[PDB]
Write a protein that binds this DNA or RNA. Sequence first.
DNA 1: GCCG
DNA 2: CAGTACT
DNA 3: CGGCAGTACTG
Length: 326
Amino acid sequence: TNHNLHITEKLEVLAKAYSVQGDKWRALGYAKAINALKSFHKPVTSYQEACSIPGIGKRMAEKIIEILESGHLRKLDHISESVPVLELFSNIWGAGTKTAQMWYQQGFRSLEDIRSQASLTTQQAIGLKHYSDFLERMPREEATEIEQTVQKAAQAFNSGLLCVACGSYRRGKATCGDVDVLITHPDGRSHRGIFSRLLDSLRQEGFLTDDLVSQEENGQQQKYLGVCRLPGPGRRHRRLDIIVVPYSEFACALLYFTGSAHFNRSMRALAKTKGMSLSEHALSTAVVRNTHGCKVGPGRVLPTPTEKDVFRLLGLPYREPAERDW
DNA sequence: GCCG
DNA sequence: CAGTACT
DNA sequence: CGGCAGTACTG
Ligand code: NA
Ligand code: NA
C-alpha cells in the first residue's frame, strides 16, 4: 501497495463511521475508493491523478489531496461523538446499526450498560457472552481441525458426504474469522435430513457450545450458524458456519461460500449486466428484470458442474480462490 | 460515496 | 415485515 | 435520477 497508507487510514475512519450510522451506500462508495487506493502502483500525488483511478470521483479526489496537502481531513473532526460507541455496540453479533442506535438513544454507552440494562435478543446475548472471541481470528491450522471435526461427524453416518472449508480458509489466508463448512452429496438425494443427525452428533461430543441461527424444526434447513470449541486447554470459542446443498448446486454454493463478499457482489453485478443472475443456488440465463433492475421473470438455470463453468458461462477468465479477495 |  | 446475517 | 447482490433465519 500500500503506497497510500496515510490516505486510506483516514478514509477508513470516515467509511466505518458512515457504515455504523447506517449510510450503507455512501459507505460502499468509500470502501471501493479505499481499495482502489490500496491497489494503486504508486503514491497518488495529483487531483487529476486521483480522478483517473476507477472508484474515485471528483469528491473523493478532493478528500485525497486535502489529506495530501494538509495531512488532515477536516471531515474527521466533525464525526459524531456517538460513532465509537455505535461501533462498540454493532460489534455484538446479532446487533446492527438499528439496534446500536436504539441502545445509544436509550442512554447506553458501554458493554456494561448493555449487559445490565439493555434488552438483548437470544443471539445478541450469545454475541455479548463471546464479545472478544468473536473479534479474534484463528490460525488457519485451527480451522482445519474444526473442518475435520465436522467432516468426521458427517462421514460417520454417511461416508459419501463431501465437506470442504470455504471462505478465507479456501482463499488461503493465514488466519480465519470463522470456519465455513460446505457439505453436499454427489449422489443427489442423500443430503436430505442430515443437519439433525450432524448437529446432534456434534452436540453429543460437546463440540457445539451455542446456536445463533438454526431452523431445525422444518426439514429444509439450509444453514447453521453457531459456536464451537475444540477440546483441551488454551482453546477459544470459534464461529462455525455450515451449509448443506443439493449436489447440482455445489459449484455455485462453493463459489458463494468461498467469496470474498466483494468478489461475489462484483460477480453477481456482472451477471446482471448480461441479463443473467447468480446466487448460491444457481447461475441463471434469460432473467427478466424491470427498469429498476428487479427480477420480474425467472429465467433458466444453467448447468454448472464446476466453478470453472460459472466463470466460463459469464465470459470471464477463471480465478483461483486466493485471487478472489476483491 | 461512484457511475451509467 | 425489518433487522441482521452469510459470502 | 437511481442502483449499488442475492440470498437465509428470527420474531
Ligand atoms: Na453486529
Ligand atoms: Na469465513
